[PDB]
Structure formats: C-alpha cells, structure tokens
Symmetry: C3
Subunit: 214 residues, 3 copies
C-alpha cells in the first residue's frame, strides 16, 4: 500500500546519490587540466555527449513526457548541470582557438539539437506515443554511453592494470544501475529498466574483472 | 484544401528550389575529373549514398506511401537523377577495374536494396503503418547525410579557412532546410520536419562560422 | 494443407544450408588446431554470430512468436556452433589477455541475451512482443551482412576469389533465397526483409566470382 510508493522512492533516491560519484569522477581528471592550465592531454567531447544524454533523459523524467518517473528527471537535471560545468571550465582552460571553437560549436549543436527534439515530442505527439518516442530516444542515447565503460574494461585487460578503473567509481555505478533497474521494474517501465539493467551487467563484469586483477 | 493549402505548396516549392544548388554542387568538383579522365583523386562514395537517400524520401513522397506530400517526391526525384548521372559519369571514368567495379556492385546494391524495401512496404503494410515505416526509414537516412556537413564544419575550424565551405552552398541548404522544416511543420509531419530541422541547425551553424572566419580572415 | 507442408520445405532448406555456413570457419580453425595458437586471429565474429543466433532463437520460440518454429531450430543449431567455436578459441589462445578479452564479452552476450530475453516477456504482451523481438533480431541480422560485404570489397581489391569460396556463397545464397521465401508466406516482414536483403548480397557475391572466373 503505502509501502510500494516509498519503495519506488527508495530505488530512485538510491540512484540519485550513487550517480553523484560518477558525476564526481571527471574532477580528478579535471585537476590535472587545472594543472599546467592547459587541456592538451585530453579532448574533451564526452562531456558534450553526457550533457546531451542527460538532457534527453531529463526530458523523459518531466511529468508531461512521463509521469511518476520524476526521480529520473532530478538525476539527469543534476547531471546536466555537472556536464555543463565541466565544459564551461573546459572551454576556459582550452589549448588553441581550434579546440575552443570546436567545443563551442558542438555545445551549440547539443543545446539546439535537444531543444528541437524536446519541442518536437510535445508539439507533434500526444501520449502515449510521446513517452515511447522520448523513451526510445532516451534509451538509445543511454546505451551509446556504455561504449566508454566497455572501452575502459578493454583497456584494463590489455594493460593488465586497474589504475584507470577506480574501484570506488565502479562500485557506486554498479549499485546506481541496480537501484534504477529496480525502479524501472517497479513502474514496469521498459525504458528505465533495460538500459540501466545493461549498465548493471557492465558494472558487474567491471567489479569481477577488477577483483582478479585487484 | 483552403488558404493554408497555398502555403504548403510554397514551402515545398521553396525547399524544392533551394535543393538543386546542393544537387548541382558536386559538378564544380566533378568538372576536374573529366579532364585527365581519372577518379584516382576522388572517391566517390557520396553520390551513391545521396542517391539511396533520395529514393527512400522520394518513395515517402508518393501518394500511397504518404498523402499530400508530393513535393518531397519531386525534390528527391530530382536529386536522384542528379546522383544517378553523377554516378554514371563516375563509372566510365573510374580509374582501375577496382574503382569501376566496386561502384557497380554498390549501385547494383542500392537499387536492389531500394526495390526490396519499397516493395516490402506496400506489400506487407496497410496504412497508416506504411507511412510511419517509410517515414522512419526515410528520416534515418536523411540524418546520415548530415555527417558530411558536420565534417566540413570541422575542417574549417582546423583549416582556419572557408575554402571548402562556400557561402552560396551554405545559404541555399539553410534555406532548403528552413523551407522543408517549415513545410513539415505545417502538415504536422515529424518525418519531414525533424531532420530538416536538424539540417537547419547545421545550416545555421555553418553560416555562423563563415561569418567568423571570413571576418577574422587575414585579408580583412 | 498443401501450403503448410510448403512452409516446412522452405524452413528445412534453410536449416540444412545453415550448417554449411556454420561449418565454414572450421577450415580456418584447423589451422588454429595445429600449434594450438591464435596469433594471427582475433575472433570477434564467433561472439557476434552467437548473439544474433540467440536473439532469433528467442523470436523463434512459440510464446515469443507462434508458428516460427523453423527459425528457432536453425539458429539454435547455429548458436551451439558459435558456442562450440568460442570454447575451442578460449583454451587455445595467444596469452591470457586474448583469452580474457573474449571471456568477458561472452559473459556480456549471455547476460545481455538473458536480460533482453527476460525483459521481453516481462514488460511486453502480444502483439507487441513479436514486434519488439523481431525488430531486435532483424536489426541484428542486417548487421551480420557487414562481413560478407567487406569480403566483396576484398575480392575487388585483390582481384582474387581466394577469400570467398564459390561453394560457400551459393549455399549461403540458397539459404537466403529459401528463408526469404519462408518469411513471405506467413507474411512475416521480420524474416523476409533481412533475408531478402541477404540474397541480394548473395547474388552479388556469385556474380563477382563468375566475373573473375571468366577473366
Ligand atoms: C578495433 C576496435 C574494436 C572496437 C573497440 C572497442 C571499444 C569501443 C567501444 O565499444 C563500443 O560499444 C558501444 C555499445 O556498447 C557501441 O556503440 C560501439 O559499436 C562500440 O564500438
């Protein structure tokens, strides 16, 4: 009765915290940027990607696009802020006109691209199609993000070292995916569960792979 | 059929008029191939890609696939002819057996691919799904086209030159996108509007850079 | 009556021709067998082929889609091969890392498949379930066409037919021609379109070989 509603609240809230560590992770890399006050070692795009991904999922969270999936709006809303901050700092601490011009442009594309689809979903669609369209787009967007953790695992093995795959980040993320998969499961929302379920698996292999290497 | 009915025609036509410049654009690049009679310098794939895009959108244009959206059929039908001509000139002038043959297989592939999907849809589907299916396929095709303008935008930034991004082409495409995005908006057609909307943003994005690099050029 | 048996014929033809495609990597594998090492080889396709065979297997089962039993049979056969091929690949390998990169991917495939296989039955009810799985399988199937196409490109560059056997392509082509036919009668887009897409490639494969055989 009252319990189920608190439980949905619990699963989402668990994720919103666990997500924070992941959001936090660029800062350690970012300090190295703050060092030498140059961006030479890394570009620099993923933040642009993460922001776009957060924006679309944020849209999904809003009550008109999907209802009772509001906790999801909060986490990406937090995340969109995180990615937005990283980029703004990235722009300031940039090496050359060329990086600065490139990142600014992509930010324009991301903001405009998101604006166009976010408007289009509400303008051109009436529920229940609007949810599945945003839900489909948001989900596809999320799975694409799995490319980076998959890549990091690939790096870890060949290198034979876990230096770049921190245990703290990997665990919090596994659990984050886990909370959300349950949350998706409770509303019987395919769009929340399936991508988050896939992330969990990736998180699971990451921990297991980590342990052997330790 | 009323007042708004004139407007849609206008937008479709306007888009239809702006589209040719994009269609014509390879010819200036193309003219060099013909002299010295070789393609060694240029491959050569995009014309094949553009054609496949034009057929699918063309098919969407047709009345059985979609109703009241023939202008789309016209613009792509026009484009497909340009692309087919571009391909054929490219075929004869292809340098080496491998270039000429590879294109033939791809060209064989494109027409076969299109015939199969165009048949499958009319055969396997009853409206409104057919419209939705083709529009979905048509739209996905159109966004892929966007890969090329994004890259040239990338080169301009690296080059710090507007040499490869002519203003005439940028404006024309921007207008084609605006016209077609507007056209889609009027009919409440997501399939036409959205990529064109996406294309408009790219077009706008291109105009902004040219203004910056042309203004910040050495000559000024 | 007459047609029902006809369904069995087209599916059977495909189920038989599949073994030839499934068998074809064995010849490259024998080379793996001598010296028990994979230095030349990184075998992503066996991991790729298994996952595709798995998903279509799901589409084949009666609760997922009904009367789609032959497709269930053929990939179920196929998945084991890929399952078998992966196993020989793991024990005989160059370094722990070649083995280890692959081990994880196999975990992903089984977990990935289980997750999607379960998710479908849990979150979806007919007629959507058939539509969802058929789509995932279909998209998966069309992706497989990438390898034969590249080989076509190779034939052109090489000016040689060494990298694609003539016997292999027709057997593949006949399966593609037969299975596309299997899909059409039940009016199943999901079976027909990709398989129809495959035969076309198959036709291209045969024609190129014929060209090179002549001159
Ligand atoms: C020789 C290079 C072989 C692939 C390189 C491995 C690391 C690349 C990250 O993986 C990516 O995962 C995504 C979904 O998980 C996919 O969008 C994408 O297709 C895939 O590339």
């Amino acid at each position: 009765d009252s319990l189920y509603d608190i439980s949905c609240f619990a699963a989402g809230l668990a994720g919103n915290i666990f997500a924070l560590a992941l959001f936090l992770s660029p800062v350690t890399t970012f300090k190295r940027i703050l060092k030498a006050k140059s961006t030479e070692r890394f570009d620099g795009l993923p933040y642009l990607f993460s922001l776009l991904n957060c924006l679309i999922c944020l849209w999904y969270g809003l009550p008109w696009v999907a209802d009772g999936r509001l906790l999801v709006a909060t986490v990406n809303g937090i995340g969109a802020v995180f990615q937005l901050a990283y980029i703004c700092l990235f722009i300031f601490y940039a090496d050359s006109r060329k990086t600065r011009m490139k990142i600014i442009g992509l930010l324009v594309l991301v903001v405009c691209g998101f604006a166009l689809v976010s408007h289009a979903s509400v303008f051109f669609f009436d529920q229940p199609l609007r949810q599945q369209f945003v839900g489909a787009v948001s989900m596809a967007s999320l799975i694409s993000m799995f490319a980076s953790p998959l890549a990091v695992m690939g790096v870890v093995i060949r290198s034979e070292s876990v230096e770049f795959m921190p245990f703290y980040l990997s665990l919090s993320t596994f659990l984050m995916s886990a909370s959300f998969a349950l949350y998706g499961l409770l509303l019987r929302d395919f769009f929340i569960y399936f991508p988050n379920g896939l992330g969990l698996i990736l998180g699971a292999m990451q921990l297991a792979l980590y342990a052997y290497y330790s």
